[PDB]
Amino acid sequence: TASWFTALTQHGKEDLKFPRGQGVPINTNSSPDDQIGYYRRATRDLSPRWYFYYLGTGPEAGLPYGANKDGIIWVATEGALNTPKDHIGTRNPANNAAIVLQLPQGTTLPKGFYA
């Protein structure tokens, strides 16, 4: 599969993390109930790259929201529904290019993350 958004690149030691309510990329064409998913760390070492996938999609579709697993953090905006977002799924690189991952301003990023 492939993430619908671009990657947040890690530069320092601090892994990616977000306070509750923040972290979900901006996607004005999706419902408020969809604003829930996870970031997955992919290390090639190199600069770690965290790719966002909606709940129930991506390499960790079977995991419930909040399932503790290394390289997987969870985010959910106030008002989302704990349901698999099958109607979004993942992106196909041959069909769609990645969306520039943007976050609402006032979002707290760790040292070494920029958006």
Which residue numbers belong to the known binding site for RNA?
44, 49, 91
Query: Which of 1, 2, 6, 9 forms a contact with Zn ion (CB under 5 A)?
Result: 9
Q: Burial code of 46-71, b = ≥16 C-beta within 10 A, e = fewer?
A: eebbbbbbbbbbbbbbebebeeeeeb
CB of 70 to a second copy, least distance (A): 21
DSSP secondary structure, 33-75, as one string: GG-EEEEEEE------EEEEEETT-GGGTTSPTT--BTTEEEE
Q: Does 11 bind a second copy (CB under 8 A)?
A: yes
How many residues sit in the footprint of a second copy (CB under 8 A)? 37
Distance CA 82, CA 85 (A): 9
Pick the stretch among 19-27, 29-37, 67-75, 100-108 that binds Zn ion (CB under 5 A).
29-37
Q: Does 97 bind a second copy (CB under 8 A)?
A: yes
Catalog residues that contact a second copy under the rule CB under 8 A.
Answer: 6-9, 11, 28-34, 44, 46-47, 49, 81, 83-88, 92-102, 112, 114-115
